[PDB]
Symmetry: C2
Subunit: 139 residues, 2 copies
């Protein structure tokens, strides 16, 4: 209901083929009227050299999730969306399991979208918070 | 000379084994007295679904580079460094070639480090700018 295109998790996941989301094991898991959820493994694909989840990989999950959320909110026959600005606080380290990100809208303007993205490990504790600004660009 | 540990590009690259840097093809390329440089391919490993460099992958390169820069600046027998906050402006899209990131220090404090990280594609034009805040934590 936030959504223009009704999210279809199969197509969301399928669309990742031959892109970093596929390579890192990102999976779109759920959605409702006001949020979209995706997760990613915490393993050697996403670790930094000390064996913790790479802070950048948290940002890949957040930008994948928010970029897809924007795509489901715009008129795709006339517009596409690109990342404009992203920021994140790294709150807790993760070593294994999966990290789950939930995106909610802060503002869907005509020319920019701002997304609130909350990540947590399998213990449910906040691990990262991101805010993503997307630009809406005419095709 | 910014550096405590003299950067050794072979060991920097070798240390990425079984981590996301290895998976994405990140390579530490150069250093001097005040900067450290690494690059990453722009291909299917790092694209988003529309065939452009994923904004998150830019952030992986930036955080890999800055995290390593911090590691070379602290007393590693007593401290380690973790990402605390990261932000980036996505300036231009890239489709192919490599993206090159250069890290310079803004502030190396006792408990935090702040890094300025500039990325550009092979045409030399700015593609992303990031600023990274690292926490210095006692072992």
């Amino acid at each position: 209901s936030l959504w223009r295109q009704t999210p279809d998790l199969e197509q969301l996941n399928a669309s990742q083929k031959n892109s970093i989301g596929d390579l890192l094991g990102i999976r779109f898991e759920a959605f409702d009227d006001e949020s979209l959820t995706a997760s990613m493994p915490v393993d050697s694909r996403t670790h930094q050299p000390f064996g913790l989840l790479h802070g950048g990989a948290s940002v890949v999950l957040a930008e994948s999730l928010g970029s897809m959320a924007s795509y489901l909110c715009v008129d795709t026959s006339q517009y596409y969306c690109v990342g404009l600005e992203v920021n994140a606080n790294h709150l807790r380290g993760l070593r294994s399991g999966r990290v789950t990100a939930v995106a909610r809208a802060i503002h869907l303007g005509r020319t920019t979208h701002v997304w609130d993205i909350r990540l947590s490990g399998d213990d449910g504790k906040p691990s990262c918070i991101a805010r993503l600004t997307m630009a809406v660009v005419p095709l």
